Design a binder for this molecule. Structure first.
Ligand SMILES: NC(=O)c1ccc[n+]([C@@H]2O[C@H](COP(=O)([O-])OP(=O)(O)OC[C@H]3O[C@@H](n4cnc5c(N)ncnc54)[C@H](O)[C@@H]3O)[C@@H](O)[C@H]2O)c1
Ligand SMILES: NC(=O)c1ccc[n+]([C@@H]2O[C@H](COP(=O)([O-])OP(=O)(O)OC[C@H]3O[C@@H](n4cnc5c(N)ncnc54)[C@H](O)[C@@H]3O)[C@@H](O)[C@H]2O)c1
Lengths: 280, 280
């Protein structure tokens, strides 16, 4: 495991959205750095599954039911973590994602759309708010709580998770795209804000990844690749979807001061060349 | 040494501009990956000094006098390297640099500058040509020679070296800024061109670094920064120059397929936050 190359013994990594697909994979690999891992998620059972796997594999982890949108809940969790492990060294803001209420059915408006089609005009204010809250405030509020504890600590840093959308928006998903542009911006803002007290901030922008959770979404109901999947492959030079494991190197690089002490305020694409391609 | 984390035993790393400040330092560290290192430079003595140090420490290196602008010379050197080590796995295009004839004395034009000041109007065509030749063709021609050999080799990849000045240009240095903008662009072009045959191409964009060779250029005022150095420091969030050591992590990240298999066409800033800040 390449994570074993990076000695983070006695450091505490706090990971939000830890029960999710990407973060649960990454959390399990980060255990091999010998760090203590706190797994924060609204879904305690999902995070606790990850904690059990880590502990069974010889690592050190614990799950904490947390709502990243509720500041005083995060603060309570921070106190429990202090009892169990200590205070934060590395914060990974993994909580995030999109939802159907802020997604259109159609790539483009048209003059001949079926009445059942959810268009731009059908997106609910609360759906848009939900996406921005989760993907921006859900990183900002944990950063307020845990960065306070990181102040002054050698090697402290923050990781946010951006998206291809932050570079150029994707069709159908305006709120998610806008919120990820905002978190890319916030990454740079934080890097500058904390630049005199030694907390770096960087982001990983994954490209198009596949997992067993989204595999079925890449096909229509008859098992043919969707037009969107075909467009993704067409506009990805390496001609494939990425895998979760392909984010691990970037994460280790950015969180390990021996590798990235002078790397700060970067949004690092891991995307098979997608953002380097014109389409032509 | 973190380079020892990355097993490149029996692979061949070809480094151009190897006798230079940054590349000589990085080549010495890459020897700890156990790769064979070929050190290419127009200054044989400078490259051979590095080869001797690497070999004395138990590494495997050889220097080769090369002009990266002369295709037939690069081809002859490629043949020599095949005899000594074999064929290229990883190419680092480190040859590059500016020329005083393509640089102004003044950051901005004014009326009634004295005759002695070298202004925009004094920039020499041959100096501008020199900078573009060295920084763009000086990467493209070795890539033509050595990528031919990398075809079919698992894990093969190309590294270019860009600059801050590629993102927005720096005062006084139009040609060097333009040529590095062009190599950033070429990095993306190569990534796409080789994307269906398994050769990644990425670039590192070092920010403002200090070395033994430029220390007395940055701190002239005995140990107070020069006016340019003060501009750099005030516009770098981390408030310091970078060191050669602080580029190694990024290099290892990008050249090791275990870390960066899906990272392609990226230009990675290593700059203390410079690119994330606008001075306000
Ligand atoms: N999956 C991808 O391919 C991909 C690509 C680019 C970016 N991202 C981003 O990566 C991050 C993780 O994505 P994912 O697909 O693995 O997510 P996921 O949907 O699989 O999991 C998200 C996790 O966040 C939890 N969560 C939701 N609301 C919460 C809240 N208020 N407080 C605490 N926890 C909450 C959920 O319970 C869940 O466990 C997100 O920021 C996502 O936007 C994902
Ligand atoms: N030094 C920095 O802080 C910095 C910052 C950003 C980018 N860069 C870029 O990093 C790379 C190395 O920079 P450096 O400062 O260490 O350079 P350097 O001037 O110290 O060394 C450059 C090397 O290239 C060799 N060279 C010149 N012309 C050649 C030719 N035609 N064929 C073969 N070799 C030739 C030189 O002999 C020299 O050894 C360059 O591309 C530079 O543009 C450097």
């Amino acid at each position: 495991n390449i994570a074993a190359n990076h000695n983070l013994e006695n450091k505490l990594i706090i990971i939000t959205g830890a029960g999710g697909v990407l973060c649960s994979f990454l959390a399990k690999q980060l255990a091999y750095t010998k760090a203590n891992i706190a797994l924060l998620d609204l879904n305690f059972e999902a995070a606790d599954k990850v904690a059990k796997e880590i502990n069974q594999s010889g690592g050190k982890a614990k799950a904490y039911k947390t709502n990243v949108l509720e500041l005083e809940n995060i603060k309570e969790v921070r106190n429990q973590i202090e009892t169990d492990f200590g205070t934060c060294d590395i914060l990974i803001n993994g909580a995030g994602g999109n939802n159907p209420k802020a997604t259109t059915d159609n790539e483009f408006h048209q003059f001949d759309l079926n009445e059942t089609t959810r268009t731009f005009f059908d997106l609910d204010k609360s759906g848009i708010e939900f996406v921005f809250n989760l993907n921006y405030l859900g990183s900002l509020l944990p950063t307020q709580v845990f960065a306070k504890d990181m102040l002054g600590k050698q090697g402290a840093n923050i990781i946010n998770i951006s998206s291809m959308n932050a570079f150029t928006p994707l069709t159908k998903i305006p709120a998610y795209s806008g919120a990820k542009a905002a978190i890319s911006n916030f990454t740079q803002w934080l890097a500058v804000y904390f630049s005199k007290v030694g907390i770096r901030c960087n982001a990983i922008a994954p490209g198009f990844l596949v997992s067993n959770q989204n595999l079925a979404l890449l096909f229509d109901t008859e098992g043919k690749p969707t037009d969107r999947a075909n467009k993704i492959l067409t506009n990805t030079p390496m001609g494939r979807f990425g895998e979760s494991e392909e984010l691990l190197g970037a994460l280790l690089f950015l969180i390990d001061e021996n590798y990235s002490a002078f790397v700060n305020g970067v949004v690092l694409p891991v995307d098979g060349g997608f953002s380097a391609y014109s389409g032509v």
